Design a protein around this ligand. Structure first.
Ligand SMILES: O=C1O[C@H](CO)[C@H](O)[C@H](O)[C@H]1O
Ligand SMILES: [Mg+2]
Ligand SMILES: [Mg+2]
Ligand SMILES: [Mg+2]
Ligand code: NA
Ligand code: NA
Ligand code: NA
Ligand code: NA
Ligand code: NA
Ligand code: NA
Lengths: 1011, 211, 170
């Protein structure tokens, strides 16, 4: 019947969805949430055979194992085993758009397993099998007999196997299809894989069982009282002796308990649900749940006979919290939330889309350590364990239905079609039915990028109906349609409007006050972290803090979707779109994370951690005002550490206990600071330290920090008198200056410093020249589809203007001998096709002390696209182990992404001055640098710089970091000015005007000498 | 949904029509067992959506109805919204679950009396004059069914009309019903007679309650 | 596949719903609402055979007329012709309440009709069959080949017969 090409058939014989069950037969075990003998796992070694299409599968496979099959591990994505290639496409579907049809050549994975079943399981009760995740559709067989069918890759499919099993050995046969009508609703921007990627288990339930249960918590005005209501549903033999007891626990103390027989209240003319009961438990002064303090209670639901016989027990963690929208604000337990969130896909560089506990824990610890308090399940229900973890560690969650039809034209072609309503409703309803009891979930999402159709409105209402405790949001069709309680745009900018027809992305500040608008605004996606990005991140957070109704957003996104491949030597390297023969593909657009696939942070993570701090500071004289942005907890594990340093030199320091109530303030007056002797700038640096370890951080953890410039005493003392006088030697070809063991050589043909000698060794491999370009960042390339080349992208404008091809034309090069120095004056003009782009005028003054003062003045044609940078570069002949500097650091920082960096004395190994972005680009820059030390060299002034073994040219010509090769010597790029990196999105110019080098005339000066 | 020609005639002769989806699960216990079950949402949605897609251009149709006697389920709320979204030109009504739920734009009770309340648990049938002013209520009230004309009936019909005329928001109703559902049978002499429930060996049956 | 006992399958190969169509090929005819030669009525005398259950239907019926079948007018309810008894119940369902199941004894009405179409209909265009009302579900066959399935007794069920039609009798 080809059910995989019929949106009308999304399952066959599948059991109803419900909350996590373990069918404990002992209440104490359910209370402690210990393992259940009634719940077995079938994960492990299975048999697998790949086929080009289902019609290729031999009939024998249903009854007997295939010799050609191999033994592989499950869960797993078969692309991760090499049976076929994983495909990375963003918007464009991986198959021809001809709904509900899929390619005749449909990759088919035949999984099979021989397992044992204890006769005890078949003598009573019900035995079902559960597939937590199968991509994308499958047929099931047990001992040769067809069982059922299922679709939707992100929610569990359950089947009753009671009448198929036999005591002893049994054999399952699962035929998984890569493509199905279900694929049309799974066009998320990620790797397209397939197989049984989530747990497979066997559950045993009594004939008379708990088939479903809902837990709700209502509160009085001040949350000093609560009522926990638990609706429990049963199946099987309904009798007067049956009872349900719901007891609530706080540790080993039972705080509440209620018992009752079945038979709900009357609801209509036909009566009520005789197979249901609702228990109501009163709880005084309940401990409230939040990401700040994840207080949890344990609820045990016991199905039993009135006289004391337990039939079965189920249970869940209960988080007492109220989520409601009032007067335009999203409130948690009555307080306005400030969502510090991030989008997180389920990705692993080695295992694909298979998740494991360790990876989940690592992510959560890293997220909380970096001040995140929320996560969005982009763009499908997650692995069941994820929610449990979020409940226990404390993270607000946006549970999103597995629905995305981005490739359709228009985007809502299927979501506005009533014939697709059935398939869609199952993706929404089954999600809610599964996760409604998790306190961590505070908002339901109808899916992602599927336009806005009537089906969305229908399902929006369905949820409001069945679960009035959680707000419902959906961004499609404009981000503010009738299908969302929250204005949830993606990449809407802070101050700039993007008036797209039909679906404009207004400036978020302006969006809130549009006539008639009252809803709160929380971006479902913003600050695209693709490669060297997150510029302008601070601008969002300043707005979030100033506008009550701007309540945050979810950064896009958590981790690069890169996969590991191996070279001929068996060495691993990160791969992206197209690296597996997959085509069409969207190359590196699958890597947009704050951390690498292996979870190593990207420089942008620190910027996020800083802007998302929970403590705000203000300075007034000797007083530091600390404000808490916590809504519930007190600062009971925080101490303030302060330090005053003069140009990196520690003068004073100390620590003060932090004792601020949520939303409160605390004043801390610093001691009488001693007026410094030396000249220079005094800097005050404060940091919040967590003395004690927690469940998510180690002792000493730094959660916040801030810097301030204090007093400054400008140096008015003239340096000592020079002993010698530099000597000039002229030739038609050069101007050579000598002073002791030091020598400078200027080429009279090029007009550049071509060499220097410190002692008996040369210092340059390449002449010191002007640089007005940079290896393009992903934000400069600005493309989200490897097929669209936006001529408006910065890289395209620089290329068309000739910035990368302009050649320096010498206009002047003269030498002058002064009383105590030699002066070299030069002027160059860079041109492209008779067009003068830049003009650089310099002077090099080498005096008797051995120092070279380089004064640079540049003119940039007002009509040429603003340049990426304005500085100099050269390849030093030597390679040193350390890089020392007085400026912003220690990590990479750019003009629009440097609030996190601190001014101080930093010292790192050369390697740390290079950021390993998978797709190479300008990187490792450090700004606000007053002094740079490398080997025998020292540069002084006020500049930005990056130093490494890779030239801008190599970075520019290389697609993968693993293909880079250290060049001889060290490449140095010292800029007087550098363009912002942007990142509001990576498919259009996103660098704010204030970070564009548009001044027309620039000036900077550097002093080069020996250390 | 009626035979297609019915709407054309109503368009031409001039009659206001309430087009109702083919959904009634009266025998379920409780009445909303199926309509509140997400597993029946697909089957129900086609009965609503396909009706709208077929008759949405008929001027005679002035109100959409989600069905009859199927309690009040989340499927009703979902389908109610679907229509409001697809065809905002017509009000949507549904009597199930109490006649004044979130799935109806019109208070549309069946057999609610003029002055006397019938405080049934959960689904009370308030006196129609009283229903209109319950705290918070503002919707119009039009009985989907009233004045059951079974046999020698229609006693008290004038009471309704005196009320409909004095109260602006009491905007009438639909009598139940138009024609006796009796079937013709022939005796030994070939003479025809009006038959009803049970006259065809059908059992169980509800006798004359079909007239 | 007992599609009549699965609320997840309310139809198979059914065309999308739409407002009344006539496919007029002349504008004035459409304005005046006169008949359309592109819309044909199949009401009239059909062949009918009653069965106690679908399993009792002989496979031969799909290929050729059943000798024991009778000629009856359509539209019509087979109860009005005397094939079985009409049932009158108010609230209580006429069948055991056990969703989505129905009785194994399920009265089955086998209708059939021999017909043919204009030559030009075999040439080009889409030819569909429209059943304004079938109570309560049905499978459709054309020239022995399975076409589709449909439910809901009160709305039309349409199927594309284009790839099933043939010259002469169908
Ligand atoms: O709009 C979006 O932007 C992201 C770009 O990386 C990614 O494609 C998300 O899934 C999509 O919702
Ligand atoms: Mg299907
Ligand atoms: Mg997308
Ligand atoms: Mg069916
Ligand atoms: Na705010
Ligand atoms: Na992406
Ligand atoms: Na403290
Ligand atoms: Na590159
Ligand atoms: Na009135
Ligand atoms: Na009646």
């Amino acid at each position: 019947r080809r059910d995989w090409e019929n949106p009308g058939v999304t399952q066959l014989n599948r059991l109803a969805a419900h909350p996590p069950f373990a069918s404990w037969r002992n209440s104490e075990e359910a209370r402690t949430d210990r393992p259940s003998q009634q719940l077995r796992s079938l994960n492990g070694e299975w048999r697998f055979a790949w086929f080009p299409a289902p019609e290729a599968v031999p009939e024998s496979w249903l009854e007997c194992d295939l010799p050609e099959a191999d033994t592989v591990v499950v869960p797993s994505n078969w692309q991760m085993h090499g049976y076929d290639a994983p495909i990375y496409t963003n918007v464009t579907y991986p198959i021809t758009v001809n709904p509900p049809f899929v390619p005749t050549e449909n990759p088919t994975g035949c999984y099979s397993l021989t397992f044992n079943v204890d006769e005890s399981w078949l003598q009573e009760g019900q035995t079902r099998i559960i597939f937590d995740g199968v991509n994308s559709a499958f047929h099931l067989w047990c001992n040769g007999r067809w069982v059922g069918y299922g679709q939707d890759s992100r929610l569990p499919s359950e089947f009753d196997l009671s009448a198929f099993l036999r005591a002893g050995e049994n054999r399952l046969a699962v035929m998984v299809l890569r493509w199905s009508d279900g694929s049309y609703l799974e066009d998320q921007d990620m790797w397209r894989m397939s197989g049984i990627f989530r747990d497979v288990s066997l559950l045993h339930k009594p004939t008379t069982q708990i088939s479903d249960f809902h837990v709700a918590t209502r509160f009085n005005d001040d949350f000093s009282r609560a009522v926990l209501e638990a609706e429990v549903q049963m199946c099987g033999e309904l009798r007067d002796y049956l009872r349900v007891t719901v007891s609530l626990w706080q540790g080993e103390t039972q705080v509440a308990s209620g018992t009752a027989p079945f038979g709900g209240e009357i609801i209509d003319e036909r009566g009520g649900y005789a197979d249901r009961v609702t228990l109501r438990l009163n709880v005084e002064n309940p401990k409230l749940w939040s990401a700040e303090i994840p207080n949890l209670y344990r609820a045990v639901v016991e199905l039993h006979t009135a006289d004391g016989t337990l039939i079965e027990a189920e249970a869940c963690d209960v988080g007492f919290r109220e989520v409601r929208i009032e007067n335009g604000l999203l409130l948690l337990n009555g307080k306005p939330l400030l969502i510090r969130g991030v989008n997180r896909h389920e990705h692993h560089p080695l295992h694909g889309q298979v998740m494991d506990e360790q990876t989940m824990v690592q992510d959560i610890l890293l997220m909380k350590q970096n001040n995140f308090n929320a996560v969005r399940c982009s763009h499908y229900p997650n692995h069941p364990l994820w929610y449990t973890l979020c409940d226990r560690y404390g993270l607000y969650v946006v549970d999103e239905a597995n629905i995305e039809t981005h490739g359709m034209v228009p985007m809502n072609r299927l979501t506005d079609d009533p014939r697709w309503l059935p398939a869609m409703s199952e993706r929404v309803t089954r999600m809610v039915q599964r996760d409604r009891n998790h306190p961590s979930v505070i908002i339901w999402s109808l899916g992602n990028e599927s336009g806005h159709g009537a089906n969305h409105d229908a399902l929006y209402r369905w949820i409001k109906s069945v679960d009035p405790s959680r707000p419902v949001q959906y961004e499609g069709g404009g981000a503010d349609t009738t299908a969302t309680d929250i204005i949830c745009p993606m990449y809407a900018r802070v101050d700039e409007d993007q008036p797209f027809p039909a679906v404009p992305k207004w400036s978020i500040k302006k969006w809130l006050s549009l006539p008639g608008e009252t809803r709160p605004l929380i971006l479902c996606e913003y600050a695209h972290a693709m490669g060297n990005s997150l510029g302008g991140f601070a601008k969002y957070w300043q707005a979030f803090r100033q506008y009550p109704r701007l309540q945050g957003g979810f950064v896009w996104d958590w981790v690069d979707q890169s996969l590991i491949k191996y070279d001929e030597n068996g060495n691993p390297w990160s791969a992206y779109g197209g690296d597996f023969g997959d085509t069409p593909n969207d190359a590196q657009f699958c890597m947009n994370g704050l951390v690498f696939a292996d979870r190593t942070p990207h420089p942008a993570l620190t910027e996020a951690k800083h802007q998302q701090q929970f403590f705000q500071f203000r300075l007034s004289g000797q007083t530091i005002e600390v404000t808490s942005e916590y809504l519930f907890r007190h600062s009971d594990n925080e101490l303030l550490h302060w330090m005053v340093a003069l140009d990196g030199k520690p003068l004073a320091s100390g620590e003060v206990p932090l004792d601020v109530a949520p939303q409160g303030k605390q004043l801390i007056e610093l001691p009488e600071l001693p007026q410094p002797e030396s000249a220079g700038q005094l800097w005050l640096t404060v940091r919040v330290v967590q003395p004690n370890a927690t469940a998510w951080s180690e002792a000493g953890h730094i959660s916040a920090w801030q810097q301030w410039r204090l007093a400054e005493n400008l140096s008015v003392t003239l340096p000592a008198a020079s002993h010698a006088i530099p000597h000039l030697t002229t030739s038609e070809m050069d101007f050579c200056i000598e002073l002791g063991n030091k020598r400078w050589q200027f080429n009279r043909q090029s007009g550049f410093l071509s060499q220097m000698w410190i002692g008996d060794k040369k210092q340059l491999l390449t002449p010191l020249r002007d640089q007005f370009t940079r290896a393009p960042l992903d934000n400069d390339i600005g493309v989200s589809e490897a097929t669209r080349i936006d001529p408006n992208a910065w890289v395209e404008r620089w290329k068309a203007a000739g910035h990368y091809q302009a050649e320096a034309a010498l206009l002047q090069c003269t030498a002058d001998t002064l009383a105590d120095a030699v002066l070299i004056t030069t002027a160059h003009a860079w041109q492209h096709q008779g067009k003068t782009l830049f003009i650089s005028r310099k002077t090099y003054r080498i005096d008797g002390s051995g120092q070279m003062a380089i004064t640079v003045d540049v003119e940039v044609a007002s009509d040429t696209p603003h340049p990426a940078r304005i500085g100099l570069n050269c390849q030093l002949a030597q390679v040193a182990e350390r890089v020392n500097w007085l400026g912003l650091g220690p990590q990479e920082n750019y003009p629009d992404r440097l609030t996190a960096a601190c001014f101080d004395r930093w010292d790192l190994p050369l390697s740390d001055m290079y950021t390993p972005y998978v797709f190479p680009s300008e990187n490792g820059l450090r700004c606000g640098t007053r002094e740079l030390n490398y080997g025998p060299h020292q540069w002084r002034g006020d500049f930005q710089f990056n130093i490494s073994r890779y030239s801008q040219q190599q970075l520019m010509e290389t697609s993968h970091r693993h293909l880079l090769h250290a060049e001889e010597g060290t490449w140095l790029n010292i800029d007087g000015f550098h363009m912002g990196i942007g990142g509001d999105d990576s498919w259009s110019p996103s660098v704010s005007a204030e970070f564009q080098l548009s001044a027309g005339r620039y000036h900077y000066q550097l002093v080069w000498c020996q250390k």
